Amino acid sequence: ELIKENMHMKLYMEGTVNNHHFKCTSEGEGKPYEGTQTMRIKVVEGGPLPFAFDILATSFSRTFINHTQGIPDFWKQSFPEGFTWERVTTYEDGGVLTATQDTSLQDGCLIYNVKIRGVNFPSNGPVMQKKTLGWEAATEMLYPADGGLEGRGDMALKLVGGGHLICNLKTTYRSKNPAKNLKMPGVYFVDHRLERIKEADKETYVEQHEVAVARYCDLPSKL
Numbered sequence: 001e002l003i004k005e006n007m008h009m010k011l012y013m014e015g016t017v018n019n020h021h022f023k024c025t026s027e028g029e030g031k032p033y034e035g036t037q038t039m040r041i042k043v044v045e046g047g048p049l050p051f052a053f054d055i056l057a058t059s060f061s062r063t064f065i066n067h068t069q070g071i072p073d074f075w076k077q078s079f080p081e082g083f084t085w086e087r088v089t090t091y092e093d094g095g096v097l098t099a100t101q102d103t104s105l106q107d108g109c110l111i112y113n114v115k116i117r118g119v120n121f122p123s124n125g126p127v128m129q130k131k132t133l134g135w136e137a138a139t140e141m142l143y144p145a146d147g148g149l150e151g152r153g154d155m156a157l158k159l160v161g162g163g164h165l166i167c168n169l170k171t172t173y174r175s176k177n178p179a180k181n182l183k184m185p186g187v188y189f190v191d192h193r194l195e196r197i198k199e200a201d202k203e204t205y206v207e208q209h210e211v212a213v214a215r216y217c218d219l220p221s222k223l
Helices: 053-059
Strands: 007-017 020-031 036-045 083-091 096-106 109-119 132-135 138-145 148-159 164-175 188-200 205-215
Touching (some): 007 036, 007 053, 053 083, 053 096, 053 109, 053 132, 132 188, 138 164
Parallel strands (some): 007 109
Antiparallel strands (some): 007 020, 036 205, 083 164, 132 148, 138 148, 138 188, 148 164, 188 205
């Protein structure tokens, strides 16, 4: 198909966090139908970054979600034309990271272009102090709205010394491919496990893995 059992990806990212401008690039592969992917990321401008790379983790891939139980795949269906997402992640200690993403498909490779802005991360907080240790697993809730698809869910950031810092993610997915052509779903969920596999040179190079599965709630129902 357009989306094969193996796919490669390329990414370009520019952003500014607390006044600090940077750029990243990356390349990866995955198995979109098994819901796995790996990305290898390099900071190419503004490095070393004065903030925890972890806050950028979710901005580097919706085509690699394994859809079970017959749930329509909002993302795989949007090709050839692809899709976009817009997100705001709000941290419980004041930090706000907004990101915009275009996903395209050209010459068989998925291309990601990302623009990011973070503001008000507190100076003595663990993001700017670089006292984080990656993300816990998480569940996302998805539902249709105003001609696109909305996601919601909290994530938990692990800290040095133990403990967690929580953020809430609000995401709008919009297909560039005309609505009538995609067969939407109702409410469903996607479980994610995003793990850092390697880093080098104070997070100038980072390798990430994600596995992701879309499913319904399996709990019995009285209705």
